[PDB]
Write a protein that binds this ligand. Sequence first.
Ligand SMILES: O=C(O)[C@H]1CCCC[C@H]1COc1ccc(Cl)c(Cl)c1
Length: 130
Amino acid sequence: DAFVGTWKLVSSENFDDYMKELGVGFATRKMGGMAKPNCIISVNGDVITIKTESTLKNTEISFILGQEFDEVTADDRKVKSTITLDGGVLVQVQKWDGKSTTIKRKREDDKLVVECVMKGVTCTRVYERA
Ligand SMILES: O=C(O)[C@H]1CCCC[C@H]1COc1ccc(Cl)c(Cl)c1
């Protein structure tokens, strides 16, 4: 839709702090921090696929909106994830061990903007079309 495409990371603010609040260790933070992934979003009927590709680590999720699914995150958390579409924003919550984080993906001009919150920490990542 507005989201379908191949997107390349162009900016990131507060991602180290976000990863620290998730409990990610120093080695993984160091690798994730200077990664510049691509994010490839596609849709086939009810099923949306988001692939994240980078030199040291790739991930993929496929989901139906509103249907919880199991996910292994890039930092190896085992989470229960739910994604909905709200006012044109893809809103993802991850739940594990009584904790949660939310990841909002939105389209703004030429940007795919990703806002990630864990407790008091807010990270903003911007992708542009490859
Ligand atoms: O920008 C995003 O898509 C956000 C979304 C939420 C998880 C956190 C980010 C994913 O972050 C990384 C960062 C580095 C690597 Cl190498 C990989 Cl596979 C994922």
